[PDB]
Amino acid sequence: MQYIKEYTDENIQEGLAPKPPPPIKDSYMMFGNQFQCDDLIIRPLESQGIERLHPMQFDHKKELRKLNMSILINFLDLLDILIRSPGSIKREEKLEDLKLLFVHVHHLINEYRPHQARETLRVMMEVQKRQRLETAERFQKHLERVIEMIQNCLASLPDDL
Amino acid sequence: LSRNEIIQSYLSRQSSLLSSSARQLHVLVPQSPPTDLPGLTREVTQDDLDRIQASQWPGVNGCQDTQGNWYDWTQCISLDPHGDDGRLNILPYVCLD
Amino acid sequence: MADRLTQLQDAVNSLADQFCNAIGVLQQCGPPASFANPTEEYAQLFAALIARTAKDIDVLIDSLPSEESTAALQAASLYKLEEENHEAATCLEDVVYRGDMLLEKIQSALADIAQSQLKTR
Amino acid sequence: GPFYLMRELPGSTELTGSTNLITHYNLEQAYNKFCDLPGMIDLPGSHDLRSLIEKPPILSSGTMLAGFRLHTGPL
To answer: What are phi and psi of B78, to 5 degrees?
Structure first.
């Protein structure tokens, strides 16, 4: 670990001689060890690296139920491999196969994660709005009570006079 | 890895069941051909936003249920998909604050 | 944390773990042969657990949101909520302003009563 | 309809470990026979140190001239 010493040497000065902040980077950086280039998609697609089993119909809940049932049936077929021919080539495919299935079951529900994120903003806004109105109504009731309180005390005072 | 014993296997059992968990399931939801931006393409209107704010919409504003009880996104749903005493407890979807 | 989504992720991982545990138990331990009962009990329990996990995963999948509520329906609702939050903010400001004026008036009146009562002495 | 990534299971009963491997491998009658050769060879000979040296050589792995050079007396 080290401390940037050249810029801290730069900072000890007066007048306008100190330095300005650096401009914003809109391209590849190298923070840490990863790159973290900007304009990235939050969910990088499945077509970048692995196969894709599902079409663009993509109605998430049906395909998640399909992938659940496919995981269970491929486990049963792996049991059929272990019963019939353990020395087959297919088990290596099978021990790859359900792996791909498991990847997709994660990769679909990660696609619920932006949506969940957006949706929590929505309900936060609704709760925010409601709380504002509640305080408004609360305060107005207090205001009314204070007014009538003042009124009845004023209603008391000529009765003393 | 090398050896699994009665007590350790039962430990695996209780840990896996405590992680995981007359019908009382959610009411089934069909496929949805009208979706708002891609599918049906509604020009931004107003009935949809009023439905998403005030009314009950079972795919968007909450999860409905058999025995009638409505649950929106910030609540936790208690169900029993099996015929046992063990109850599934779906946690809230949003968890505000 | 504490979402239906993290519950579904942990349920799917528990399914994969029950697969590996079921094979590693039911191959490592067994009665020899003939050309035990604890192992049979283990098999029944493992099958029941895998079935229960599958049912739970299916229920959680049914529970999450549909393929309605696309992102534009979220965004337009967010826009409408920003507008109504602005209106609620100005309304709260107006009621606070009226209360502030009334409070300053009653405060000054009470101060004048106190000044008179101290001056009479 | 079809589940994702279904495939064909192997041939119904190929060579497994669930068969009787011995009876398939024609070794049944030897087992049904079988289920000391020191004693079975002492049927021929008398009985059965330097025999330890015999086993150690096992664990390690001019005749007329000998009869002519074998001169030794009787008594």
So the answer is: -105, 125
* CB-CB under 8 Å, D5 with A84: no
Chain B residues in contact with A124 (beta carbon < 8 A): 96
Neighbours of C85 (CB within 10 A): 14
Strand ranges inside chain B, DSSP E: 62-63, 71-72, 77-79, 88-90
Q: How far is D22 from chain A (nearest CA, A)?
A: 19
Chains B and D touch (3+ CB pairs under 8 A): no
| Residue with tokens 């209107």, as numbered in its chain | B45
Chain B nearest CA to C97, separation (Å): 30
Residue bearing tokens 């192992």: C39
- Annotated resolution, angstroms: 3.5
Cα–Cα distance between A122 and A118 in angstroms, integer? 7
Tokens representing residue C18 in the block = 């029950």
All residues at 6 or more sequence positions from A109 whose CB lies less than 8 Å from its CB, including other chains: A64, C5, C8, C9, C64
Output the six-digit token pair for A34: 């990863």
Q: Minimal CA–CA distance to C27: which of B10, D22, A95, A79?
A: A79
**Cβ pair C89:A132 closer than 8 A:** yes
Q: How many helices (H) and strands (E) does chain C have?
A: 3, 0
Q: Select from C99, C117, D23, C78 the least CA-distant residue to A150.
A: C99
The residues facing B89 across adjacent strands are B78
Find out whether C3 and B89 touch, Cβ atoms under 8 Å.
no
Amino acid (1-letter code) at residue A124:
M
CB B73 within 8 A of CB C80: no
Residue C55 is nearest to which of B35, B81, B92, comparing CB atoms? B81
Q: Is B77 helix (H, G, I), strand (E, B) or coil?
A: strand
Amino acid A75 reads F
Helices (H), chain A: 5-11, 60-84, 90-109, 112-160
